[PDB]
Amino acid sequence: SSLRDPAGIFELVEVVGNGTYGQVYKGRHVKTGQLAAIKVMDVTEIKLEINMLKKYSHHRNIATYYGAFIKKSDDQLWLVMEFCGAGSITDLVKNTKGNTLKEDWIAYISREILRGLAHLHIHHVIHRDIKGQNVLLTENAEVKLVDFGRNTFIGTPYWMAPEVIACDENPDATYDYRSDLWSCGITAIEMAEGAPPLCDMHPMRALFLIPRNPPPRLKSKKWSKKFFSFIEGCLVKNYMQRPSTEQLLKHPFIRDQPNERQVRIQLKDHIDRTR
Ligand SMILES: Nc1ncnc2ccc(-c3cccc(Cl)c3)cc12
Ligand code: NA
Numbered sequence: 185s186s187l188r189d190p191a192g193i194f195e196l197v198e199v200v201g202n203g204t205y206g207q208v209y210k211g212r213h214v215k216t217g218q219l220a221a222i223k224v225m226d227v228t229e230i231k232l233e234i235n236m237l238k239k240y241s242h243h244r245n246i247a248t249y250y251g252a253f254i255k256k257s258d259d260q261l262w263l264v265m266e267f268c269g270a271g272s273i274t275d276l277v278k279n280t281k282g283n284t285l286k287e288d289w290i291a292y293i294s295r296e297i298l299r300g301l302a303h304l305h306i307h308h309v310i311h312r313d314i315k316g317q318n319v320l321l322t323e324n325a326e327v328k329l330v331d332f333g334r335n336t337f338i339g340t341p342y343w344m345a346p347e348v349i350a351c352d353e354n355p356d357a358t359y360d361y362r363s364d365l366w367s368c369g370i371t372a373i374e375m376a377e378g379a380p381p382l383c384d385m386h387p388m389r390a391l392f393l394i395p396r397n398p399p400p401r402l403k404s405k406k407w408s409k410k411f412f413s414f415i416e417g418c419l420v421k422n423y424m425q426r427p428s429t430e431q432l433l434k435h436p437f438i439r440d441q442p443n444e445r446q447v448r449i450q451l452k453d454h455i456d457r458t459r
Pocket of ligand 1: 331
C-alpha cells in the first residue's frame with residue numbers, strides 16, 4: 185500500500201547508456217545479483233502508474249516492470265524494470281560491419297517490435313517513442329520495448345510521424361496508435377541503412393520536412409520486394425490510410441520468416457562477437 189525505500193533491495197551501478205536515456209541506470213537486485221534498469225525521477229498518482237505499467241509490461245516483447253521505490257531526502261522515485269544486457273538495436277547496427285543488418289534480421293526484429301506494439305495498442309496505450317534506441321536486446325537475443333508511459337524538452341525528430349508535428353492544417357498534433365507504426369518503419373530503415381532518413385539534416389529542418397516530404401524510401405535497390413512493401417505500409421503519409429499493427433503483422437515481410445530459427449542463432453552469436 186506504500187512505496188518502500190530502495191536501500192538493501194536495489195542499488196545503482198552505472199548510468200545507461202552513459203548519457204542517452206537521461207537518468208536511467210544499470211542497477212542490481214541486492215539479494216540476488218539480478219540486473220535491473222532503474223529510472224530515477226525527482227518527485228514532490230505514482231501508485232496508479234505502478235499498477236498500470238505492471239499489467240501492460242507482462243508481455244514477452246516489453247521490458248517487465250518490477251516496482252517503484254522512494255529514496256528520501258527533493259525525494260527520488262525509482263522505477264525498476266527488467267534489464268536487457270545486449271544493448272539497443274541502434275548499438276547493434278553501429279557495431280555491425282557496414283552499419284547494415286541482413287534483411288532476415290530486420291524481419292525478425294521488426295516482427296518482435298510489432299508484437300510488443302500490438303499488446304500496447306490492444307490495451308489503448310501508445311508507445312510514442314519507437315526508435316532503435318528504445319528497442320533492446322537480451323543475451324538470448326530477445327527483443328523488448330522500453331520507454332512507455334518534466335516534459336520541457338523536445339527530443340530527436342527523425343522517428344516522428346507527420347501527424348505528431350504541429351503545422352498550419354494540423355494545429356493540434358495527433359499522437360494516434362498508427363504513429364508508432366510510422367516509427368517502426370523508420371526503425372526498419374535505421375536497421376537497413378545505419379541511420380534514419382533525414383539524418384543528414386539539422387533537427388529543426390527535419391521537423392519542417394517530415395509533414396511535407398513524400399514517404400521516405402530505402403536508398404538501395406538490393407532489398408527484396410517484400411521489404412520495400414513493408415516500408416511502404418509503415419510509412420503511409422496520411423495516418424488515416426496507414427495499416428494497423430494487426431495488418432502489419434500479416435504483411436509477408438513479417439509473416440513469412442522461414443529462417444527464423446537460424447536468425448535467432450545468428451543474432452545470439454553476433455551479440456557475443458561484438459560485445
Ligand atoms: N530495461 C532496460 N535495459 C537495459 N537498458 C536500458 C536502457 C534504457 C531504459 C529506459 C529508457 C528510457 C526510459 C525508461 Cl523507463 C527505461 C531501459 C533499459
Ligand atoms: Na515483459
